[PDB]
């Protein structure tokens with residue numbers, strides 16, 4: 001019931017998450033202030049597995065200054081046996097908040113979208129394509145969405161192919177536009193309450209449906225024609241035809257108060 005990171009002492013309240021290797025806690029320091037500590041167990045991981053967490057920490061360090069839509073890493077400790085990461089605790093992950101809500105406020109959704117774009121745009125500017133974008137990768141802090149990780153690490157639950165882009169599937173026999181596809185489905189989930197291919201349970205049929213142009217994604221008419229425009233442009237199978245994040249940011253949907 002106690003963790004020491006770079007001198008400071010933190011007391012474990014509860015546990016938020018657990019990977020095979022790692023664990024996430026809600027903690028309090030000496031001043032009763034709330035934080036989140038990612039503890040990773042390095043006993044024992046391959047030379048390759050080690051570098052993944054090293055890379056994730058390095059990039060999470062280098063990017064603190066460039067955006068506040070990246071989660072805040074206050075301090076960290078790393079030995080040969082463990083890693084501890086003192087981060088923002090926030091309120092709740094986007095994945096869980098989506099389930100515990102039935103209908104989503106349009107004004108909230110637009111501000112959440114604008115936040116994700118900013119965050120993903122940032123990592124792109126430093127040559128980082130998140131290879132596995134999902135709601136669970138975003139943290140709500142004061143109603144502000146923040147990116148938690150960069151997909152370089154090994155992912156964590158409190159395993160879906162819904163957010164997977166066609167080019168990744170066609171690759172079996174990286175582009176920044178992949179994150180644009182995954183973000184599309186997250187906003188699609190915020191717009192129509194489900195992901196574009198959620199209901200197809202057969203996995204060899206779902207993946208075939210994603211890549212297949214003959215399969216057509218249904219877009220019901222919403223009172224926000226722009227939101228519609230975004231949804232269609234993001235869900236284009238051809239990454240050259242697909243909209244870019246700098247384009248997405250000049251889009252009326254995010255720029256026009258209506």
Ligand SMILES: Cn1cc(-c2ccc(Nc3ccc(C#N)c(NC4CCCCC4)n3)cc2OCC#N)cn1
Nearest residue numbers: 017024036038088089090091092093096156157158
């Ligand atoms: C159903 N539920 C999930 C949460 C929750 C979830 C996450 C966080 N905060 C953080 C803060 C940092 C990380 C990291 N790294 C992280 N990761 C979780 C781990 C499990 C998978 C989802 C992301 N979560 C705070 C959360 O709220 C507790 C607080 N404060 C609350 N209810």
